[PDB]
Design a protein around this ligand. Sequence first.
Ligand SMILES: Nc1ncnc2c1ncn2[C@@H]1O[C@H](COP(=O)(O)OP(=O)(O)OP(=O)(O)O)[C@@H](O)[C@H]1O
Ligand SMILES: Nc1ncnc2c1ncn2[C@@H]1O[C@H](COP(=O)(O)OP(=O)(O)OP(=O)(O)O)[C@@H](O)[C@H]1O
Lengths: 514, 514
Amino acid sequence: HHHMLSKQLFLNRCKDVEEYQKAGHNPWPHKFNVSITVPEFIAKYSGLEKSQVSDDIVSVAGRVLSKRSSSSALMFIDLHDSQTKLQIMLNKSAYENKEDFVSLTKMIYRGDICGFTGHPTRTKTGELSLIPISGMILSPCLHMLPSMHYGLGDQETRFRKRYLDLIVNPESVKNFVLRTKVVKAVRKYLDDKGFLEVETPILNTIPGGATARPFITHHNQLDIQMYMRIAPELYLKELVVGGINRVYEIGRLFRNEGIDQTHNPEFTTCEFYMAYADYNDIMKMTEELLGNMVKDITGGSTKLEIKKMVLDFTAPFKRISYVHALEEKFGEKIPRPLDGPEALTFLKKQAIRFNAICAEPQTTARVMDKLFGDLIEVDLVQPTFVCDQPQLMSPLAKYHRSEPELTERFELFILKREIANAYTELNNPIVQRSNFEQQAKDKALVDEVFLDAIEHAFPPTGGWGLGIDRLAMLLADVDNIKEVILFPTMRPEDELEKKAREAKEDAMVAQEKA
Amino acid sequence: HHHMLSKQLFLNRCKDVEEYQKAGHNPWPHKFNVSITVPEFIAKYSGLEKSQVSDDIVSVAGRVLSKRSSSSALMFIDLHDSQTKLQIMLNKSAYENKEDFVSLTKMIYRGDICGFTGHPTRTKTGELSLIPISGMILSPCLHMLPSMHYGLGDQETRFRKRYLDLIVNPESVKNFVLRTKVVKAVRKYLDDKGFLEVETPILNTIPGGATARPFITHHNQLDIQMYMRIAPELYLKELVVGGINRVYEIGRLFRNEGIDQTHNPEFTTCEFYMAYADYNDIMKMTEELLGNMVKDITGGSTKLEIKKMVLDFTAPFKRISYVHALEEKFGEKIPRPLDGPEALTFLKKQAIRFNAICAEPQTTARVMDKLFGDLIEVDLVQPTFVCDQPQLMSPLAKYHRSEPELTERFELFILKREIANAYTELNNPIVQRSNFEQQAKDKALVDEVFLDAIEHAFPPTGGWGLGIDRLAMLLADVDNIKEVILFPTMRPEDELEKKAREAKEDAMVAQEKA
Ligand SMILES: Nc1ncnc2c1ncn2[C@@H]1O[C@H](COP(=O)(O)OP(=O)(O)OP(=O)(O)O)[C@@H](O)[C@H]1O
Ligand SMILES: Nc1ncnc2c1ncn2[C@@H]1O[C@H](COP(=O)(O)OP(=O)(O)OP(=O)(O)O)[C@@H](O)[C@H]1O
């Protein structure tokens, strides 16, 4: 008989509650006035010591994670609020309503949300506590909360029921608080620099020239097929055309592709565009911003990740040129026209020499990308900008102002992976048109609106993009993106894994009762 | 021959540009260092007076909206930046490169993005200007920018090409700057009160019990149909269950319905949930927040909208009870069991008396809603909370703690319309279950995850929601939501309105040249 005991416990718990409601007690009261939060409590009354009782009358509320008593007239409750704990010493002699004292002290179940009003104290055991004059059930818990900790690992039982995870693994909250701290740090930095935070469409009537598979939907009244955005770039750029010099958007993007530890179907990035700025300015800005972030997290620009290891966000960051690093380790330089014959015939040599086996098709772009990917990326642990990618690698970028066959852009690598990137955006409408068309033919309708917009003179502009989820990952020292996303996209379980899950869920309980 | 002259102008403009590029001049330079923005310029050098020339060398950049000369050695350019203008007095005798002076002063087209480096001055005409030592084209404009102003009204030519609108109607920028100012005002207020700004899924595997038609999409790898969110409520509430006491999200919602002046397929709202708080607290918070917003906009809590009229955001706001206002104007009170027979038979009386013709079906909820909608809503111009809606009207709300047949919630009405709303959220898992099931049968799969979550004791919580787009509308004194949305969803024009549009676009030019 499938999950026999937890059904039994749910039913008996509902019973307990409604009989507690006839008994005269409203299990879900409308308002309990909380005079102080338990972190504030700890901050205010830590100066107390053993057996010393404050004269104050404060009221707190949270979730019971421990109910244990050494006597019928003396109970000890671990109440949890904002991921910190305060003990509740329920002493009968100190409780006003002796009749209610009993009823409350029996009805309380582990998991119940409770409120208590009483005197701050520190017991003879050193444990900071509150001695209630009056308490009340604020919301009864109808299920057995898992032990503490539970779900380490087995990530799916955690992420499917995030509300349980945050309770039994409170440390995980530290992660999300970091993430918010990140986005704020971004916004502030940009806002203080005259940027206008805006909102551009998520639904588009044009799929975009990007190769990534988009989520596809349909608008009924207009009877048209629409697509979810892959990036806000075009609209933002149209805003810079429109006269808003500095714009930014921290938005939700959508890719209908695979799901792994670094990919979620819907993710969050930050893009900004800044008129009359080049990728150098954006580099300094990036150093500045990430710097301030890390120095909030710690105090110095140096962080420590996983035993230990240090990540030095001290300005300036390392920076290297692409083809200059490839030529730095190949032996000597590379043939001119990089997209040419001699350069590919040359590339293949180190693409059989340096333990590098490239793939098919063997495009110059591909052998160059793999040679840089296995070879140069490997020991890029410290924050470093890889700059001046070739036109071979950069279709929609602007040519480098000095040295030929290169472009003005960079990719910020930290800990083997790409965190952010920037460009001296291409503002040539003719070239942009050619590239857009050539792109559309390559993937075989183009965004003529945007082409028109930039045809109305798009100012020299610096573009920047940051992976919010991945930056959060890197700063929380986690290797799974679901660790920095509250409700990551889960494959809906059928009744197989469901049945197994519940079955184990009883295996625990039967392990207790026997 | 369709749009004959603007094609001609585009081609001749491209010509002009490339011949200007052989001539030795790069039409799209990579970096122009702007030493000062023209609002900063005006703020710094306004103290100058007629014929007085500063010794400083500053450089500015913007978009030419006027090129006019009284001599070949003296040109006057209205350069626009951040929606303000600075005149550029190009005097040959003050220009270093006399050879370049000429070339630049001829190549410049109205609409070009230009940069100038020179001395701040105020001319004998009182016009604050800058006399360049050197200038440069930063990005050429390949089309004829419409006159100023243009597109008033004819909202669609504006909103399809927003980048033009923001140029020829710079006042419209004031609107969007307001909107951002709004969201920041929200975030701050909440952030300073311990709230955690979070991000919940937009894509869901469950459609939701709401009646609104959702946008429908498909995830390929999981081979499952997914739906775009109607509200973040459930997830946020799961976060409050999880131990995060105060959460909020300013997010993008999606409704696959109609498009009008107050509706856009994708819109933006703010929701927050706050443990151990009731709708009264949320009322005071609402007064506080909106108050601060308005007082930033002006200086006092009193605003002025469209001739003129005043909106008094002074705390406290007016507040009335639903059935108490209906009974305030009906004549006397209403029969008990409001959902009952005598109450409907009673309702029909004033639903033939008070010029009120209700509709079919004649549900008690419907006749009550219409009677309140035509009658009580009408002269609610000042910010006022309509509170204590009946269970007839409130399916998923919590019963009122005192007076029967009412619930704990409010709707903030300003200027005939609903701006925000709040609840003392229902935290009874059994009742919530019953309501969810009954709802699902009413619209005929339910969200069992959320039901489980609240079954694990959901604390007494206050919920709040605000219409960001509509609040922005109301504070910008506009009657169209496209006025506060940058790129509102437009029905893609076929070649009919397209051809007509371009044809008129030439009618203008031919009106000039003849
Ligand atoms: N599914 C996703 N989840 C989280 N972030 C993503 C996802 N897809 C793309 N990004 C972000 O978008 C940016 C550009 O990614 P790109 O277009 O290279 O996708 P990709 O080829 O999948 O990259 P990678 O293979 O390195 O994940 C990256 O900085 C990354 O942080
Ligand atoms: N298409 C939309 N555009 C902008 N805001 C919307 C849209 N749909 C809903 N909202 C917002 O959602 C909130 C709840 O709206 P509701 O569920 O009553 O939709 P509705 O029945 O269309 O309302 P109304 O008819 O008053 O617009 C409102 O405060 C409104 O501001």
